[PDB]
Design a protein around this ligand. Structure first.
Ligand code: R85
Length: 315
């Protein structure tokens, strides 16, 4: 492959001040904070992530740092730098609105069709960039999408992300805790992960957003999910979903991974829908909903139903 000439920035403990704890969970912890770089009249809102010092807990964080310092896209979380204290700290940008799962739940009655369809375009842009950089996320879910502003989301959690060689097209995992309700059938039965198994996970992510934060296959144990998907059974059509949006989800869940749409196609599809959002999502209250010419397929010609902007047409 090409040389990865990315720069790993190492930060002084003194340069940044913690403020509050954000989470507890599996991972490590995660704190809110401020980063005042040395001799710069700049104060950067940051999120400091750590793990308890174990040689395995320091190795896993540095592999994540490797991935995060390589990526650079408006819809992908970037690493600001690392701090080399007893316990290694990952310093990333603060996403003041938290994760997208918690946000759809907390704001269930204020989210309109324009917002949902735009997060779908943004998640597909971030995932396409990862496909370009030959990275397989392996953990795409709504909890792993952070909110910078309600109008701007970014993909996070690279703690499972795998890079592929130019003469490599699959990642064969050996073992480890895996979220089964988001996994592709080939991933559950053969431990194979491709960008196309990420497209499956994208389908469940869109489903979580469309159901305003519902749990996929609720009340159904993990051991049973592999069978359900073998029969032909998929997740239900959400109430707000027209058959157009649902057909896209259903395609992300084909048994043949090559039949599923590509992330560049998912961008085009959700972009067209975002130009007339009320034709694709039926939400009670849409016209009067807020979260604190130029944006419709009208403009000046014929049937501009298939009009895509160049920024959405990636190849
Ligand atoms: C003010 O900023 C945040 C506030 C947060 N609220 C949401 C509302 C909550 N009330 C109303 C109950 C309080 C906590 C949260 C948050 C909450 N839950 N989660 C999962 C994240 C997150 C952020 N921002 C933020 N910016 C950057 C990163 Cl990297 C990050 N990470 C993170 C934090 C906690 C747990 C897990 C992670 P992960 C493993 C997904 O990286 N988190």
């Amino acid at each position: 492959e090409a040389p990865n000439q990315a720069l790993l920035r190492i930060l002084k403990e003194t340069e940044f001040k913690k403020i509050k704890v954000l989470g507890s969970g599996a991972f490590g912890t995660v704190y809110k904070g401020l980063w005042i770089p040395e001799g710069e009249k700049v104060k950067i809102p940051v999120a400091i992530k750590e793990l308890a010092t174990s040689p395995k807990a320091n190795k896993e964080i540095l592999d994540e740092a490797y991935v995060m310092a390589s990526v650079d896209n408006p819809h992908v979380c970037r690493l600001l730098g690392i701090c080399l204290t007893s316990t290694v700290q990952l310093i990333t940008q603060l996403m003041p609105f938290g994760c997208l799962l918690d946000y759809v739940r907390e704001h269930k009655d204020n989210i309109g069709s324009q917002y949902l369809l735009n997060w779908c375009v943004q998640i597909a842009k971030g995932m396409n960039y990862l496909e370009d950089r030959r990275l397989v996320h392996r953990d795409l879910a709504a909890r792993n999408v952070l909110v910078k502003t309600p109008q701007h989301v970014k993909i996070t959690d690279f703690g499972l992300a795998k890079l592929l060689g130019a003469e490599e097209k699959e990642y064969h995992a050996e073992g480890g805790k895996v979220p089964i309700k988001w996994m592709a059938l080939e991933s559950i039965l053969h431990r194979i992960y491709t960008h196309q198994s990420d497209v499956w996970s994208y389908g469940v992510t869109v489903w979580e957003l469309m159901t305003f934060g519902s749990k996929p296959y609720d009340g159904i144990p993990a051991s049973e999910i592999s069978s359900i998907l073998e029969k032909g059974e998929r997740l239900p059509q959400p109430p707000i979903c027209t058959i157009d949006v649902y057909m896209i989800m259903v395609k992300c869940w084909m048994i043949d991974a090559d039949s599923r749409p590509k992330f560049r196609e998912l961008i085009i599809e959700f972009s067209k829908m975002a130009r007339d959002p009320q034709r694709y999502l039926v939400i009670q209250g849409d016209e009067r909903m807020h979260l604190p010419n130029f944006y419709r397929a009208l403009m000046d010609e014929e049937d501009m139903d298939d009009v895509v902007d160049a920024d959405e047409y990636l190849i």
